[model samples]
Target: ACKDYLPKSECTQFRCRTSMKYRLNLCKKTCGTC
Candidate 1:
């Protein structure tokens, strides 16, 4: 899924963690783009 959303050419690598899950739990919080 990571490779599909963001290409390696654009981004070298990606990192995700359980702690970061909260950032997505709330719809009010907007990170990058919708």
Candidate 2:
């Protein structure tokens, strides 16, 4: 899901401790996964 409905370009990149399960982004202190 998108972080607080933020745009993909606006969001940041993140990773999990395990494998690269999904694309993560952070904006306005919100976290989104795809």
Candidate 3:
């Protein structure tokens, strides 16, 4: 699940669109600094 959900580029892009901080944080925390 980690590898599938957590590609650095994808995660960053997700963060860019989503304004809901909790959702962004979830992705960031799950994916890390990638």
lDDT of 3 at 10: 48
Off by over 4 Å in 3: 1-4, 13-17, 21-34
Query: Which pairs of residues collide in candidate 3?
Result: none
Tell me each candidate's RMSD, in Å, in order. 9.4, 7.1, 5.8
Model 1 steric clash pairs: none
lDDT of 2 by residue, 1-34 (tens): 2344355454444432232333342343232444
Better of 1 and 3 by TM-score: 3
Sort by lDDT, top down from the best: 3, 2, 1
Mark the regions of model 2 whose C-alpha exceeds 4 Å error after superposition: 1-3, 14-34
Measured with C-alpha atoms, the lDDT of residue 22 in candidate 2 is: 34
Q: Which lDDT value does model 2 have at 10?
A: 45
Give the winner by TM-score. Answer: 3
Local distance difference test, candidate 2? 0.38
Ranked by lDDT, the better of candidates 1 and 3 is 3
Where does candidate 2 clash, by residue pair? none
**Which order, best to worst by TM-score?**
3, 2, 1
